[PDB]
Every structure is written in C-alpha cells, then in structure tokens.
Design a protein around this ligand. Structure first.
Ligand SMILES: *[C@@H]1O[C@H](CO)[C@@H](O[C@@H]2O[C@H](CO)[C@@H](O)[C@H](O)[C@H]2NC(C)=O)[C@H](O)[C@H]1NC(C)=O
Ligand SMILES: c1ccc(-c2nc(NCc3ccco3)c3ccccc3n2)cc1
Length: 336
C-alpha cells in the first residue's frame, strides 16, 4: 500500500568518507548519528550497557533503555560483521524517528565496539537499508517497517552525497519514498538487481583510460562504503594501470600526477559511468614529494555476495542513486 508521503533525512559529510544523518530512539528521543547503509540490513547504536573499557563507547552516544518509556526488551544476542569491523550486543525494540517518520523498530544495542575502527567513526551507529534477506537475526529492517505503514508515495529511497567543503553546504540527503530533482539532472538509467535481497547489480566492464570485468562481474551499490572497491586481484590490476603504490590500507600516487591520471569507467546497464581523477583522487597537494590517497580500495567481500565490486560514496557523489524496492532495480542519474 502506497500513501502520499516523502520524507528527507539531511546528511552530514565528514571528510568525504562518512555520510551520516540523525535518528531519534525512544521516549523521549535519544539522538544518534547514523550511516544509512544499503550494504547491510540491521539497525544498531551503541548501548549504555557497553563497558567503558571499550573506549569507542566512551566517545559515542549510548542508548539508555532505562531512560525510554517506549522501550521493549528482547535481549537476543547479535553480532554484525562489516568489512572494516565487527560489533556485538543484543536486540531491543523502541520507537525510532527518521525524517519525521516514526516507526517501531527492533535494533541492536551494541555492547562490544572495537576501538579500531570505531574510535575513528564520527557516526554512532548504522541504519541498514538492505533487504530482510541479509538481516542478521531475521530482524525486519527499518525501511520494510516504514513501507508497512503505507505512508510512502513510492517503495523507493534515494541518496545524494555532496562533495565536502562551508558549513552552509548540504552534506547529503536521503529521500524516503522518492527522489529529489534538485540533486540530479538528466534521466535515471536503471539496472535490475541480480536478485531481490541485495542491492547488487551486474557490471559489464571496468575501463581505465576495457582492462577489467571483461566477461561481467558484480557491483554492490553500497551507500555505507566510503570508496569504490574491487577484489584484490582487480584492484592490483586497476592500480598497476594507474601507477599507484600499495600501502597497508590504501593506494597512493605522487600528488603531482593525481590531476592527469586516466578516467575510470564502470559499464552498468546501458550506460558508461565515468569518473575522472578529480572524482577519485584526494588532491590534498600538487607536490611530487607528497602522496595522495585514492578513493578506490581493495576489499574482498566473501560469498555469497562476493567476490564483488562495491560502488560507495566515491561513485554516489557523482551519480545520484535511487534504490527501487517495488521494481527491484537501482537508478543512477548525474548528481548536481
Ligand atoms: C525476541 O524477539 C523474537 C522475534 O520476535 C521472539 O521470538 C518469537 O517468540 C515467540 C514466542 O514468544 C514465538 O512464537 C515466535 O515464533 C518467535 N519468533 C522467532 C522469529 O523466533 C522472542 O520471544 C523475543 N525474546 C524476548 C525475550 O522478548
Ligand atoms: C573509520 C571508522 C569507522 C568506519 C566505518 N564506516 C562505515 N561507513 C562509512 C560511510 C558512510 C557513508 C559512506 O561511507 C561503516 C559502515 C557500516 C559499518 C561499519 C562502518 N565503519 C570507517 C572508518
């Protein structure tokens, strides 16, 4: 059932790598900064029950069930394993407000929150925008619960991620139930999902200056990933072609060579989605003696989802993305 509501969540852009918005949990609302992540399907925030020996819990907002009159205990343990780290804790139910939509939502109260990486998170928690099929503990995801209310105009949500800057700039925007034509131009071009249950599409090629994915591969369209990622062997080849040098967590080029690195193009559906070096180089200098990191990383995502590329914020900054649950497709349009 479809209504006439669309709702928007204003996002903050932290250093082009973490895009997060606000949710309120409980009565009265406890506010949390959260990443909205199409790569996962669970909601979690740090818990007041998190031992303060987890320094990440000292440095983030903690949900306190004992201050919420709308809290409903559950207590089933859950562990959520992401590509960059793991959190563990237990299930709780409470009222969650997101863009002025209020939903009764089961979520994780995280009691184990590793300092690496979570001391480096500006956000507190995560709101998974993936399908119930990938939800740990079969917890109904938030967007599914919003859809059940029958208020949303369309069974879709859309992501705009801005370039960083100053504070008057909008970091980004999620539209629940539609899209915002203020943040894209031209027409959407749609690629059907490989299957329902994951925001993943076929990719027909990756070109540097068709070097890779020549017989097709997978692209997870991942709003919770900072970067474009490929498999180690893909990225090793991609980076050799860019003249980039591998470091522990990233690849770098000499900053003076950054501006003249070749275009990288991603063949999705009918269209080529092209990034110039300005879209994937963190140009912090123009010096031959400084190293500039690339917004393309190696990430071996395990099966059944991987091996797969992930199109994260690096991609979404250039291409406004609509996630269409009704038609099991993803639409891209040129962001403005
Ligand atoms: C935590 O939530 C789960 C899921 O809703 C509850 O499990 C259900 O329990 C009822 C009986 O109370 C069963 O009839 C359902 O079949 C269970 N569902 C699933 C998916 O397992 C569980 O009871 C809750 N636990 C607590 C302590 O509140
Ligand atoms: C330091 C500390 C924490 C992270 C990090 N970042 C995540 N997403 C970043 C993001 C948001 C929007 C686009 O990209 C993330 C998502 C899901 C689970 C864990 C995560 N941990 C990264 C660096």
């Amino acid at each position: 059932t479809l209504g006439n509501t669309t709702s928007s969540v204003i996002l903050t852009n932290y250093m082009d790598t973490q895009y997060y918005g606000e949710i309120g949990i409980g009565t009265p609302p406890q506010t949390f900064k959260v990443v909205f992540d199409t790569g996962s399907s669970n909601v979690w925030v740090p818990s007041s029950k998190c031992s303060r020996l987890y320094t990440a819990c000292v440095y983030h907002k903690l949900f306190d069930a004992s201050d919420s009159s709308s809290y409903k205990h559950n207590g089933t343990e859950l562990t959520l394993r992401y590509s960059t780290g793991t959190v563990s804790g237990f299930l709780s139910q409470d009222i969650i407000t997101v863009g002025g939509i209020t939903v009764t939502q089961m979520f994780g109260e995280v009691t184990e929150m590793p300092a690496l990486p979570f001391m480096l998170a500006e956000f507190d928690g995560v709101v998974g925008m993936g399908f119930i099929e990938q939800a740990i503990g079969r917890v109904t995801p938030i967007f599914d619960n919003i859809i059940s209310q029958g208020v949303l105009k369309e069974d879709v949500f859309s992501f705009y991620y801005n370039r960083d800057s100053n504070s008057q700039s909008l970091g980004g925007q999620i539209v629940l139930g539609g899209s915002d034509p203020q943040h894209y131009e031209g027409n959407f071009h749609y690629i059907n999902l490989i299957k329902t249950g994951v925001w993943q599409i076929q990719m027909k090629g990756v070109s540097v200056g068709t070097l890779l994915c020549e017989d097709g591969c997978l692209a997870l369209v991942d709003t919770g990933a900072s970067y474009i990622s490929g498999s180690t062997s893909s990225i090793e080849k991609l980076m050799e072609a860019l003249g980039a040098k591998k470091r522990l967590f990233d690849y770098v080029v000499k900053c003076n060579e950054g501006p003249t690195l070749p275009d990288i193009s991603f063949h999705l559906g009918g269209k080529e989605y092209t990034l110039t070096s300005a879209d994937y180089v963190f140009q912090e200098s123009y010096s031959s003696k400084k190293l500039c990191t690339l917004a393309i990383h190696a990430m071996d995502i395990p099966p059944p989802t991987g091996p797969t590329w992930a199109l994260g914020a690096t991609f979404i900054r250039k291409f406004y993305t609509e996630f269409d649950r009704r038609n099991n497709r993803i639409g891209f349009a040129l962001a403005r």
